């Protein structure tokens, strides 16, 4: 799955490999799968792009 | 409405009964004006054919092909066409026609077909699974057999792998036998790939020489060059007609267009892939094709 | 018994012609097809030509018009005419024999003849 | 994106129509996806198939 | 007649970026205001395209593979590049293809040429020098046509060989950039389809010497290789491909 | 049987997934339900069918 903002905004993308461990494929391990290209932050915001298992992505670079 | 609702009493309301569609008034056939006969006499009536391992390929293009003298000739014992009916061969315009000529024995004529196995299909001449064209074969015992034995015709006996479709192997290479190399005489003596057919006229049917010509086509992907004898009709504007442009059949109204076609470009296709515009032969003009009026009654 | 013997080899000038002979003894020369094969030092075997009882001669597509295979059946012999000799034709030549009614097994072989070309 | 609920319905209906139109281009294992080509190329015993 | 060129300067070939070049029309069908997905032998976007020079002393006529297809770009002024050689062994054993564009016409011949080690044309300061092959014995196909042709001219060609057909696609672009490939998009129209029916694995660029030894005119060319992939092409209201997307380049374009 | 409504949904979803898995073991009139067996036992003209 490709997580992106609008192409009017930016061309940066993140890749989610669903149900795939990160050792079998900015690399973060979620319960949904392995997310590559998103910087995991400790802050909590509203959900902009849903990833799953409580993980959401947003553009501010792409953060998860 | 009574027939549609299956009742003799119809209640008040609106009922969808059928679909009105205007029918075409006349058929227009447009073919290239060119009138050059195709040299089938140089293919079928040739004095010499090459062997099946080195089969002869002739490209036939830019001519009018009269197929009706082929099927109605009683000389051909086998006339089997795959992907096209032989009667309809006059009505279609082809491109990239290939004539493949060779000589094989009698019971191997069944091996000139898609999906067959044998020595000829694997190592000599392979037809693809998606083959469109015609296989024509006739007995030639009184030309290709000599009383001492004719040896001008060869077939490859063994290859390391099966051939690709329409692949020619004229390469004659010494090959090994197994567990001893071909390092001279010293090992197991080295087998030769090409064996000659034993053609004598006293041989029974099944061993006798049969001449095979395989015609292979491509179905309307480029500006076509090989077309049947059909006479080109005049063009009519703004009327529902059932047209035939170089083998492309259909129904619609032909109108003037404002689509700036590039010189290579001939026709146009919609999302459904049905043709929406066409370039007519002989006059090179671009005619838009709009489907005839239809709707619900 | 079955035997193939060859003759005609030697050390010859390049461009001079050669006539290599393959005499057969012990078997009837009909119903068998005869091959000419050569091999260079440091190189593998290279097939030259085939000839049958009809007189149909088949050559290697790699080399053209250099050789000419000529069968003769009155004295059970086979001749090769080689014309316009190049420097790379230094080779050991072999005469081979196949049965027309089976697989292409070449059965017995000639012992071979040596052709050396130099200036 | 205020009116996304109506636009979603419009997009779904248009996309369903586009897919239904696109499905005519598929031959489903036949020699061609065009009926006129089959009717002009083959005899009725195999054109029927 | 063959002539060895022994005044070359040793230099490795260069590499540069393809950007979004090498797109050709995949078929002969008109399409307008549509987005069409096609799977064909295309040049990948932002690929590593090999750069060869002709400058004085550089004269780049190497032996290059053909592979599945060749994109040939030319930043040309004063008409040095004249044609191409295609084949497998480039001798009389196999059958080879000759494309030349001399001062009069464009000639395509399929013959068994015994090619020279350094095939070339020549201009005297008039064209009076032609050393490409030493013999031509068995010729099957001949085709004489119209002339196809700071760096001022950009020539893009796409050479493909499928099913015995050699497809040449061409585009001519007026540019004013000095050294590299301009960054932009230009769809290559099909130029010619040749029924050559021969095996091609190797190709050669033909250049022209300048004589007044020899002098090489200022020219530069680029060789890229086609791969089977999918593009999303955009057709405008005039039927011209104005933009393209490489489906396997990055996840955004995917 | 207090929470039967949620258990019915869970059972229906699991049973539908199990049925979709078990449909792979059916040959649907072919010689075998395994594609590899068909590709290894038959030539491509009949293996295609
Ligand atoms: C130009 O140079 C090439 C490469 O050095 C020459 O090709 C060689 O020529 C010699 C002499 O006949 C042969 O023995 C070699 O086998 C050739 N090499 C190859 C790879 O074929 C070529 O002959 C030179 N041109 C001229 C006119 O002499
Ligand atoms: C071959 O010759 C026969 C002899 O009359 C003729 O009837 C036939 O039409 C010829 N075939 C072709 C293809 O010319
Ligand atoms: C015949 O068709 C060609 C196109 O193939 C065209 O150029 C030519 O003008 C036509 N001739 C006539 C008399 O219509
Ligand atoms: C192109 O290839 C060369 C060598 O093959 C390599 O050094 C260079 O980094 C490559 N360039 C790109 C952009 O990949
Ligand atoms: C083309 O030539 C190459 C090498 O010259 C060879 O490996 C390949 O098999 C040839 N292909 C055909 C179809 O002849
Ligand atoms: C161009 O090449 C053709 C083909 O051989 C030849 O007939 C013609 O004379 C050449 N013209 C010049 C100017 O060399
Ligand atoms: C090719 O040319 C050579 C020499 O000119 C000739 O011996 C040979 O027969 C030719 N090949 C064919 C198929 O005509
Ligand atoms: C299409 O062609 C017209 C001229 O007929 C031109 O005005 C228009 O700008 C063209 N479209 C584009 C996108 O360039």
PDB file of N, CA, C and O in Angstrom, chain E residues 174-197:
ATOM      1  N   UNK E 174      14.229  20.933 -32.121  1.00  0.00           N
ATOM      2  CA  UNK E 174      15.139  22.087 -32.085  1.00  0.00           C
ATOM      3  C   UNK E 174      15.489  22.418 -30.641  1.00  0.00           C
ATOM      4  O   UNK E 174      14.604  22.690 -29.827  1.00  0.00           O
ATOM      5  N   UNK E 175      16.783  22.390 -30.318  1.00  0.00           N
ATOM      6  CA  UNK E 175      17.265  22.677 -28.974  1.00  0.00           C
ATOM      7  C   UNK E 175      18.385  23.703 -29.058  1.00  0.00           C
ATOM      8  O   UNK E 175      18.940  23.970 -30.124  1.00  0.00           O
ATOM      9  N   UNK E 176      18.712  24.283 -27.900  1.00  0.00           N
ATOM     10  CA  UNK E 176      19.830  25.210 -27.797  1.00  0.00           C
ATOM     11  C   UNK E 176      20.653  24.945 -26.538  1.00  0.00           C
ATOM     12  O   UNK E 176      21.298  25.858 -26.010  1.00  0.00           O
ATOM     13  N   UNK E 177      20.648  23.709 -26.047  1.00  0.00           N
ATOM     14  CA  UNK E 177      21.388  23.368 -24.842  1.00  0.00           C
ATOM     15  C   UNK E 177      22.772  22.882 -25.262  1.00  0.00           C
ATOM     16  O   UNK E 177      22.933  22.244 -26.306  1.00  0.00           O
ATOM     17  N   UNK E 178      23.775  23.192 -24.442  1.00  0.00           N
ATOM     18  CA  UNK E 178      25.157  23.003 -24.877  1.00  0.00           C
ATOM     19  C   UNK E 178      25.620  21.553 -24.751  1.00  0.00           C
ATOM     20  O   UNK E 178      26.121  20.970 -25.719  1.00  0.00           O
ATOM     21  N   UNK E 179      25.465  20.936 -23.578  1.00  0.00           N
ATOM     22  CA  UNK E 179      26.199  19.686 -23.375  1.00  0.00           C
ATOM     23  C   UNK E 179      25.358  18.437 -23.158  1.00  0.00           C
ATOM     24  O   UNK E 179      25.687  17.390 -23.719  1.00  0.00           O
ATOM     25  N   UNK E 180      24.280  18.498 -22.389  1.00  0.00           N
ATOM     26  CA  UNK E 180      23.611  17.269 -21.992  1.00  0.00           C
ATOM     27  C   UNK E 180      22.233  17.148 -22.646  1.00  0.00           C
ATOM     28  O   UNK E 180      21.842  17.963 -23.489  1.00  0.00           O
ATOM     29  N   UNK E 181      21.503  16.106 -22.262  1.00  0.00           N
ATOM     30  CA  UNK E 181      20.133  15.927 -22.720  1.00  0.00           C
ATOM     31  C   UNK E 181      19.220  16.938 -22.037  1.00  0.00           C
ATOM     32  O   UNK E 181      19.279  17.083 -20.809  1.00  0.00           O
ATOM     33  N   UNK E 182      18.406  17.681 -22.788  1.00  0.00           N
ATOM     34  CA  UNK E 182      17.414  18.559 -22.160  1.00  0.00           C
ATOM     35  C   UNK E 182      16.375  17.752 -21.398  1.00  0.00           C
ATOM     36  O   UNK E 182      16.043  16.622 -21.761  1.00  0.00           O
ATOM     37  N   UNK E 183      15.859  18.347 -20.329  1.00  0.00           N
ATOM     38  CA  UNK E 183      14.877  17.691 -19.479  1.00  0.00           C
ATOM     39  C   UNK E 183      13.488  18.118 -19.938  1.00  0.00           C
ATOM     40  O   UNK E 183      13.146  19.303 -19.885  1.00  0.00           O
ATOM     41  N   UNK E 184      12.702  17.148 -20.386  1.00  0.00           N
ATOM     42  CA  UNK E 184      11.385  17.422 -20.917  1.00  0.00           C
ATOM     43  C   UNK E 184      10.790  16.144 -21.471  1.00  0.00           C
ATOM     44  O   UNK E 184      11.325  15.052 -21.266  1.00  0.00           O
ATOM     45  N   UNK E 185       9.673  16.298 -22.176  1.00  0.00           N
ATOM     46  CA  UNK E 185       8.980  15.147 -22.730  1.00  0.00           C
ATOM     47  C   UNK E 185       8.674  15.396 -24.198  1.00  0.00           C
ATOM     48  O   UNK E 185       8.207  16.476 -24.571  1.00  0.00           O
ATOM     49  N   UNK E 186       8.931  14.385 -25.026  1.00  0.00           N
ATOM     50  CA  UNK E 186       8.617  14.445 -26.449  1.00  0.00           C
ATOM     51  C   UNK E 186       8.369  13.031 -26.948  1.00  0.00           C
ATOM     52  O   UNK E 186       9.285  12.203 -26.929  1.00  0.00           O
ATOM     53  N   UNK E 187       7.145  12.753 -27.386  1.00  0.00           N
ATOM     54  CA  UNK E 187       6.785  11.408 -27.808  1.00  0.00           C
ATOM     55  C   UNK E 187       7.291  11.157 -29.220  1.00  0.00           C
ATOM     56  O   UNK E 187       7.121  11.999 -30.105  1.00  0.00           O
ATOM     57  N   UNK E 188       7.900   9.996 -29.436  1.00  0.00           N
ATOM     58  CA  UNK E 188       8.544   9.697 -30.708  1.00  0.00           C
ATOM     59  C   UNK E 188       7.518   9.120 -31.674  1.00  0.00           C
ATOM     60  O   UNK E 188       6.903   8.087 -31.390  1.00  0.00           O
ATOM     61  N   UNK E 189       7.341   9.776 -32.814  1.00  0.00           N
ATOM     62  CA  UNK E 189       6.453   9.233 -33.826  1.00  0.00           C
ATOM     63  C   UNK E 189       7.132   8.081 -34.562  1.00  0.00           C
ATOM     64  O   UNK E 189       8.357   8.071 -34.709  1.00  0.00           O
ATOM     65  N   UNK E 190       6.366   7.082 -35.004  1.00  0.00           N
ATOM     66  CA  UNK E 190       6.955   6.007 -35.815  1.00  0.00           C
ATOM     67  C   UNK E 190       7.398   6.518 -37.175  1.00  0.00           C
ATOM     68  O   UNK E 190       6.651   7.207 -37.871  1.00  0.00           O
ATOM     69  N   UNK E 191       8.624   6.165 -37.549  1.00  0.00           N
ATOM     70  CA  UNK E 191       9.213   6.628 -38.795  1.00  0.00           C
ATOM     71  C   UNK E 191       9.076   5.599 -39.908  1.00  0.00           C
ATOM     72  O   UNK E 191       8.577   5.925 -40.988  1.00  0.00           O
ATOM     73  N   UNK E 192       9.494   4.357 -39.664  1.00  0.00           N
ATOM     74  CA  UNK E 192       9.462   3.346 -40.713  1.00  0.00           C
ATOM     75  C   UNK E 192       9.352   1.971 -40.062  1.00  0.00           C
ATOM     76  O   UNK E 192       9.760   1.766 -38.914  1.00  0.00           O
ATOM     77  N   UNK E 193       8.736   1.039 -40.786  1.00  0.00           N
ATOM     78  CA  UNK E 193       8.671  -0.366 -40.408  1.00  0.00           C
ATOM     79  C   UNK E 193       9.307  -1.166 -41.535  1.00  0.00           C
ATOM     80  O   UNK E 193       8.843  -1.107 -42.678  1.00  0.00           O
ATOM     81  N   UNK E 194      10.366  -1.901 -41.218  1.00  0.00           N
ATOM     82  CA  UNK E 194      11.122  -2.613 -42.230  1.00  0.00           C
ATOM     83  C   UNK E 194      10.959  -4.114 -42.064  1.00  0.00           C
ATOM     84  O   UNK E 194      11.184  -4.639 -40.966  1.00  0.00           O
ATOM     85  N   UNK E 195      10.552  -4.831 -43.116  1.00  0.00           N
ATOM     86  CA  UNK E 195      10.438  -6.304 -43.053  1.00  0.00           C
ATOM     87  C   UNK E 195      11.763  -7.010 -43.324  1.00  0.00           C
ATOM     88  O   UNK E 195      11.946  -7.722 -44.317  1.00  0.00           O
ATOM     89  N   UNK E 196      12.724  -6.829 -42.416  1.00  0.00           N
ATOM     90  CA  UNK E 196      14.064  -7.347 -42.673  1.00  0.00           C
ATOM     91  C   UNK E 196      14.179  -8.838 -42.340  1.00  0.00           C
ATOM     92  O   UNK E 196      14.835  -9.589 -43.071  1.00  0.00           O
ATOM     93  N   UNK E 197      13.530  -9.296 -41.271  1.00  0.00           N
ATOM     94  CA  UNK E 197      13.527 -10.702 -40.884  1.00  0.00           C
ATOM     95  C   UNK E 197      14.875 -11.308 -40.547  1.00  0.00           C
ATOM     96  O   UNK E 197      15.128 -12.467 -40.898  1.00  0.00           O
TER      97      UNK E 197
END
